[PDB]
Structure 1
Amino acid sequence: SPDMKLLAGASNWVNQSGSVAQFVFTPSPTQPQTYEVSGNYINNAQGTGCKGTPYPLSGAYYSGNQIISFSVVWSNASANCQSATGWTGYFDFSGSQAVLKTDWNLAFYSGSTPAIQQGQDDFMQSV
Structure 2
Amino acid sequence: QDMSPRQSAEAFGVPAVSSSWVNQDGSTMTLVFGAGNSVSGFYVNNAPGFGCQGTPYPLVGLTWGNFIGFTVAWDNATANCNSVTSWTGFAEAAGSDVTIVTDWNLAYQGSSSGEIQQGSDTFTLVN
- Which deviations, in whole Å up to 9, do the C-alpha atoms of 1:13-55 show, x marking residues without a partner? 1001110110001121xxxxxx110000000111210000000
CA distance in 2 between counterparts of 1:45 and 1:110 reads: 19
Superposed, 1:87-102 pairs within 5 Å as 87-102=87-102
Question: In the alignment, residue 43 of structure 2 is paired with which amino acid?
Answer: Y
Structure 1 alignment gaps of length 5 or more? 29-34
In structure 1, what is the equivalent of residue 122 of structure 2? 122
Aligned-pair CA distance for 1:76: 0.4
In structure 1, what is the equivalent of residue 10 of structure 2? 3
In structure 2, what is the equivalent of residue 45 of structure 1? 47
RMSD value, Cα: 1.9
TM-score, normalised with respect to structure 2: 0.86
Following superposition, which runs of at least 4 residues in structure 1 exceed 6 angstroms of deviation?
A: none
Identity %: 47
TM-score, normalised with respect to structure 1: 0.86
- Which deviations, in whole Å up to 9, do the C-alpha atoms of 1:47-97 show, x marking residues without a partner? 21000000000000103xx10000000000011000000000000013441
CA distance in 2 between counterparts of 1:95 and 1:46 reads: 31
Contact 1:92 1:100 survives alignment (8 Å)? yes
